[PDB]
Amino acid sequence: AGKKVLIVYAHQEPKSFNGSLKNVAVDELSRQGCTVTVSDLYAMNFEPRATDKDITGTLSNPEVFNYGVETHEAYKQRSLASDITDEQKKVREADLVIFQFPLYWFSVPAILKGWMDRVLCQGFAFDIPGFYDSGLLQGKLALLSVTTGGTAEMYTKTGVNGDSRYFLWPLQHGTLHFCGFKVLAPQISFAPEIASEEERKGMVAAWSQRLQTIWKEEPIPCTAHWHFGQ
Amino acid sequence: AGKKVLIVYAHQEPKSFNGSLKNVAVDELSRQGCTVTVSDLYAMNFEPRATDKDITGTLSNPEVFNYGVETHEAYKQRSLASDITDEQKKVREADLVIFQFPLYWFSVPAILKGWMDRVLCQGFAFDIPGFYDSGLLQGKLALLSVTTGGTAEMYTKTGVNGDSRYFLWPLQHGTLHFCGFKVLAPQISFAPEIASEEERKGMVAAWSQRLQTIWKEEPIPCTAHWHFGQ
Numbered sequence: 001a002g003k004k005v006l007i008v009y010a011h012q013e014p015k016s017f018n019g020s021l022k023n024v025a026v027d028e029l030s031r032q033g034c035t036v037t038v039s040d041l042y043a044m045n046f047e048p049r050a051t052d053k054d055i056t057g058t059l060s061n062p063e064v065f066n067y068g069v070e071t072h073e074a075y076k077q078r079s080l081a082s083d084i085t086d087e088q089k090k091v092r093e094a095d096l097v098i099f100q101f102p103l104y105w106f107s108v109p110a111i112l113k114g115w116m117d118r119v120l121c122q123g124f125a126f127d128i129p130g131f132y133d134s135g136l137l138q139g140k141l142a143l144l145s146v147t148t149g150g151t152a153e154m155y156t157k158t159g160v161n162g163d164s165r166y167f168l169w170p171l172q173h174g175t176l177h178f179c180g181f182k183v184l185a186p187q188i189s190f191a192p193e194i195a196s197e198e199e200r201k202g203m204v205a206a207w208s209q210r211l212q213t214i215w216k217e218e219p220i221p222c223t224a225h226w227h228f229g230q
Numbered sequence: 231a232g233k234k235v236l237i238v239y240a241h242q243e244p245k246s247f248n249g250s251l252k253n254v255a256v257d258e259l260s261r262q263g264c265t266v267t268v269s270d271l272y273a274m275n276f277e278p279r280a281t282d283k284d285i286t287g288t289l290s291n292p293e294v295f296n297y298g299v300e301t302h303e304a305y306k307q308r309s310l311a312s313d314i315t316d317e318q319k320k321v322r323e324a325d326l327v328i329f330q331f332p333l334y335w336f337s338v339p340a341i342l343k344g345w346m347d348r349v350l351c352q353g354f355a356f357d358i359p360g361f362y363d364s365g366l367l368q369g370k371l372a373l374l375s376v377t378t379g380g381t382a383e384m385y386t387k388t389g390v391n392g393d394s395r396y397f398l399w400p401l402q403h404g405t406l407h408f409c410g411f412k413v414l415a416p417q418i419s420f421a422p423e424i425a426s427e428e429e430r431k432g433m434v435a436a437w438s439q440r441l442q443t444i445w446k447e448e449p450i451p452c453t454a455h456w457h458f459g460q
């Protein structure tokens with residue numbers, strides 16, 4: 001209600017189920033009085049590739065290009081490409097970052113993987129040392145709102161695809177927790193293409209419903225046990 | 231007769247450790263008499279975004295764009311973009327596909343995620359019921375040759391990053407095994423940037439040596455147990 005939210009959205013079609021989930025999030029968070037910003041990656045033609053065009057100043061080592069080293073320096077020097085710094089400003093100001101996307105190969109679509117690769121650079125999102133619980137984005141919350149082609153049953157320990165929490169590991173732990181985020185439970189909307197119109201409406205309303213009390217939620221314990229068990 | 235190998239390579243710098251690993255694989259497999267092809271993604275400025283430009287001609291439903299449906303239809307109608315079909319031909323002809331890349335956020339760099347998203351389309355790499363053990367690329371071998379920033383110790387069951395098999399899941403099981411590939415054990419070159427010059431030349435040498443008997447190797451048992459179990 002007195003918070004800022006950044007929604008990083010990755011779907012090509014406004015009329016899609018992902019489009020609906022993104023829109024209801026904007027509607028509900030706005031109704032609450034929150035400040036809301038959406039980075040619609042495909043509409044922005046967001047650059048996913050990590051290249052030397054991401055640094056505009058003199059390279060530290062112009063003979064052997066190392067993306068991590070050069071972007072870390074460029075961040076400190078303020079010589080990163082502006083599309084990257086534009087996103088960093090949104091993240092810096094946000095209290096909560098919601099990622100809205102369809103699962104592609106049990107991960108994020110490449111345009112969103114590119115956002116992770118390029119925006120969460122050393123110096124901004126983490127440092128060495130300064131990761132996991134000491135990540136630079138500590139104090140901020142993050143939530144993955146994903147949609148799948150597979151059904152919930154397929155995403156179980158005994159299902160063909162295994163438990164859904166397994167594929168969340170690189171994203172929730174390896175990325176968000178690594179950067180210091182407290183991770184809220186994922187919103188997983190299963191197989192909307194298969195579901196009925198009513199079921200679809202039900203999944204949208206369940207997300208809107210959850211958002212009504214999102215600020216009262218506790219984050220998940222982002223650990224190997226939560227993700228894998230035993 | 232002999233064997234064909236496709237190396238999908240994702241690094242910006244020819245002089246990099248990844249570059250050396252790619253070059254030694256070409257050298258050794260070429261020496262053995264194998265047919266070798268390399269898709270140098272950054273040099274090709276490979277497009278990572280899944281968009282409507284991936285279909286030439288007219289869409290099956292230009293009212294509501296569904297990437298999966300549209301690319302499935304385009305594959306069947308021979309209407310996919312040429313960058314995608316060029317890669318599919320290389321995959322179709324290959325007996326082994328080696329992916330050479332540095333680990334970015336517990337996964338592949340976005341440009342390689344884009345190759346995965348755009349090249350491995352329904353109808354080409356999988357279908358109903360062609361998936362996992364019956365995936366359409368059955369008969370082919372696949373192998374991940376990854377370099378990391380974190381030490382082998384950090385990637386232990388109780389290490390801060392967790393076991394490496396944890397992040398391998400979405401790639402080995404969710405992607406490669408899903409498409410029918412028999413997955414060979416991953417080649418992990420841990421923290422080459424911190425290692426000594428000789429430890430480095432050592433890691434390169436180990437990879438070249440392993441490649442000497444790559445065709446005698448047996449595919450790992452790609453299962454939830456292999457990745458998380460004991």
Ligand SMILES: Cc1cc2nc3c(=O)[nH]c(=O)nc-3n(C[C@H](O)[C@H](O)[C@H](O)COP(=O)(O)OP(=O)(O)OC[C@H]3O[C@@H](n4cnc5c(N)ncnc54)[C@H](O)[C@@H]3O)c2cc1C
Nearest residue numbers: 016017018020102103104105106147148149150192200298
């Ligand atoms: C490259 C690629 C890789 C993939 N890999 C995976 C994977 O690893 N695992 C997996 O499980 N899936 C995978 N998928 C499938 C993908 O995750 C699903 O297609 C996606 O999650 C469905 O989301 P959508 O928004 O596109 O659905 P839509 O096609 O939009 O379908 C949802 C339906 O809901 C309707 N709808 C929209 N808004 C509303 C509303 N407000 N109320 C009611 N109905 C509404 C739509 O019109 C539509 O008919 C992959 C897809 C691609 C293209």
Ligand SMILES: Cc1cc2nc3c(=O)[nH]c(=O)nc-3n(C[C@H](O)[C@H](O)[C@H](O)COP(=O)(O)OP(=O)(O)OC[C@H]3O[C@@H](n4cnc5c(N)ncnc54)[C@H](O)[C@@H]3O)c2cc1C
Nearest residue numbers: 068246247248250332333334335336377378379380423430
């Ligand atoms: C966006 C991003 C996200 C990342 N996320 C992760 C992550 O999730 N997990 C993680 O662990 N790390 C992560 N990293 C780190 C990354 O995985 C490592 O930086 C990368 O794997 C190192 O490989 P390289 O080829 O770039 O090394 P290089 O720096 O190119 O090479 C290391 C050294 O080897 C030397 N060398 C090259 N060839 C040879 C040879 N033939 N013999 C001897 N010496 C040689 C080089 O000159 C150099 O000094 C991330 C990096 C970035 C930029």
Ligand SMILES: COc1ccc2[nH]cc(CCNC(C)=O)c2c1
Nearest residue numbers: 149150298301302347350351352
């Ligand atoms: C990995 O498992 C799945 C499961 C359900 C799915 N539905 C659709 C796709 C992929 C469709 N991509 C293209 C480019 O055509 C898919 C993959």
Ligand SMILES: COc1ccc2[nH]cc(CCNC(C)=O)c2c1
Nearest residue numbers: 068128174178335336379380381
């Ligand atoms: C997990 O996320 C990341 C992201 C960008 C990165 N750059 C470099 C490293 C690892 C290098 N650290 C040590 C001391 O082993 C890294 C990790």
Ligand SMILES: [Zn+2]
Nearest residue numbers: 173177222223
């Ligand atoms: Zn965690």
Ligand SMILES: [Zn+2]
Nearest residue numbers: 403407452453
């Ligand atoms: Zn498997």
